[PDB]
């Protein structure tokens, strides 16, 4: 299973608290329990735009996680809606990468963002 330090890192991602709670709600009949956890994280944090694990994720006001580059490309195309639910984020949507999420994902999947 996951470790205390992993739990501490997850607790820091305060803007995905509800989601992480569901992830944590998820013992397997095959392989190891930590593998089940990893499977569930990967599924939960898929970017809808590029179909990869989100990298430099933006956690939108409407509580969806999209890569910054994917959201940036959409805005440059003059599409200011959430790719996941089409809530109107608006022009000049002030974004910051969700660093706590990025830190968790980089710890669980080191190097997944190589060249991203
Ligand atoms: Zn993406
Ligand atoms: Zn949304």
From Swiss-Prot:
Subcellular location(s) per record: Nucleus
Protein task: Multidomain protein that acts as a key epigenetic regulator by bridging DNA methylation and chromatin modification. Specifically recognizes and binds hemimethylated DNA at replication forks via its YDG domain and recruits DNMT1 methyltransferase to ensure faithful propagation of the DNA methylation patterns through DNA replication.
Induction cue: Up-regulated in proliferating cells, and down-regulated in quiescent cells. Down-regulated upon adriamycin-induced DNA damage, in a p53/TP53 and CDKN1A-dependent way. Induced by E2F1 transcription factor.
Designated name of the protein: E3 ubiquitin-protein ligase UHRF1
Gene: UHRF1
Zn finger limits (RING-type): 47-86
Expression (tissue specificity): Expressed in thymus, bone marrow, testis, lung and heart. Overexpressed in breast cancer.
Domain of life: Eukaryota
Record: disease: Defects in UHRF1 may be a cause of cancers. Overexpressed in many different forms of human cancers, including bladder, breast, cervical, colorectal and prostate cancers, as well as pancreatic adenocarcinomas, rhabdomyosarcomas and gliomas. Plays an important role in the correlation of histone modification and gene silencing in cancer progression. Expression is associated with a poor prognosis in patients with various cancers, suggesting that it participates in cancer progression.
Residues of the full protein shown: 675 to 793 of 793
Domain notes: The tudor-like regions specifically recognize and bind histone H3 unmethylated at 'Arg-2' (H3R2me0), while the PHD-type zinc finger specifically recognizes and binds histone H3 trimethylated at 'Lys-9' (H3K9me3). The tudor-like regions simultaneously recognizes H3K9me3 through a conserved aromatic cage in the first tudor-like subdomain and unmodified H3K4 (H3K4me0) within a groove between the tandem subdomains.
Subunit (UniProt): Interacts with DNMT3A and DNMT3B. Interacts with DNMT1; the interaction is direct. Interacts with USP7; leading to its deubiquitination. Interacts with histone H3. Interacts with HDAC1, but not with HDAC2. Interacts with BLTP3A. Interacts with PML. Interacts with EHMT2. Binds hemimethylated CpG containing oligonucleotides. Interacts with ZNF263; recruited to the SIX3 promoter along with other proteins involved in chromatin modification and transcriptional corepression where it contributes to transcriptional repression. Interacts with UHRF2. Interacts with FANCD2.
Effect of residue 64 to A: Abolishes E3 ubiquitin-protein ligase activity
PTMs per UniProt: Ubiquitinated; which leads to proteasomal degradation. Autoubiquitinated; interaction with USP7 leads to deubiquitination and prevents degradation. Polyubiquitination may be stimulated by DNA damage.
Residue numbers carrying Phosphoserine: 30, 32
